[PDB]
Amino acid sequence: VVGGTEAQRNSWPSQISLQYRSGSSWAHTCGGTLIRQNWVMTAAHCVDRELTFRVVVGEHNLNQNDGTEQYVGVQKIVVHPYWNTDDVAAGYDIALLRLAQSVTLNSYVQLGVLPRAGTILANNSPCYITGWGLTRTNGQLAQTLQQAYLPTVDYAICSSSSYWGSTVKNSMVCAGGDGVRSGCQGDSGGPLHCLVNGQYAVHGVTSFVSRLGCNVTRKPTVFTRVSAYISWINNVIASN
Ligand SMILES: [Ca+2]
């Protein structure tokens, strides 16, 4: 997250860190959202590599003992069947991870609430992106979980030629674009949390930014629109 602030450690208890095994250690690669005690929602592109993955719930500082973490292996990966790694602009950037154990819930570890199917946010709706991703374009991962205020940019604006044009689909949510605040590498797969009727819900899965950089004016961060995938999510969890 470029232009973020440090999250309070109990603000976003559905946020997870998706890590892969790297020699004798683990490396953060992506975010995700805990949606069942044994299921995480992330981006498909975060799991294209043939890596060994784990999920960390109750994580705040990637580099220090928080006293709240639970570490759990990924047992099964179900990528959306229409995903194509060489066409992120087509959409379908979503995957579900079944965890090897069910995590224990507490003020640091909660299920993310998803919107009702078909819900579309008014332009300029209040949302936060969260994650441990780069804090500058071509920078480094954050140590502590970051949040940035990223209001939505509706499809009509986002798909206009000075924004994303044809690259954005109605199956996506755009947010931000102010040139200061954005998602960045390492945020992918994590949530966009939007305040609706007094409660935050996870409306987006972080998918892409411009090839020119993270915080580029009129290139809002692009997310998979969770509310387009409710039936898919429910069907995968029911069949696995
Ligand atoms: Ca930690």
Side-chain angles (χ1 to χ4, degrees), residues 149-153 163 174-179 181-182 218-221 223:
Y149 184 70
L150 292 189
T152 64
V153 180
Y163 287 73
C174 304
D178 75 354
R181 279 151 324 174
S182 70
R218 295 191 178 211
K219 295 289 178 293
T221 306
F223 304 80

Side-chain angles (χ1 to χ4, degrees), residues 192-208:
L192 180 72
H193 311 270
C194 305
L195 180 60
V196 185
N197 296 316
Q199 297 286 152
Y200 282 99
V202 179
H203 283 247
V205 176
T206 304
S207 180
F208 64 91

Side-chain angles (χ1 to χ4, degrees), residues 59 61 64 66 69:
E59 183 70 290
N61 192 315
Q64 294 190 201
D66 291 299
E69 303 95 325

Side-chain angles (χ1 to χ4, degrees), residues 9 56-60 65-71 106 108-109:
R9 70 171 67 245
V56 194
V57 302
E59 183 70 290
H60 184 70
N65 182 27
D66 291 299
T68 56
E69 303 95 325
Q70 305 165 48
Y71 302 89
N106 56 49
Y108 309 100
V109 183

Side-chain angles (χ1 to χ4, degrees), residues 216-237:
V216 170
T217 305
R218 295 191 178 211
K219 295 289 178 293
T221 306
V222 185
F223 304 80
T224 305
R225 180 167 54 87
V226 174
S227 72
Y229 293 90
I230 300 305
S231 292
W232 179 76
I233 293 167
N234 285 346
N235 287 343
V236 169
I237 292 170

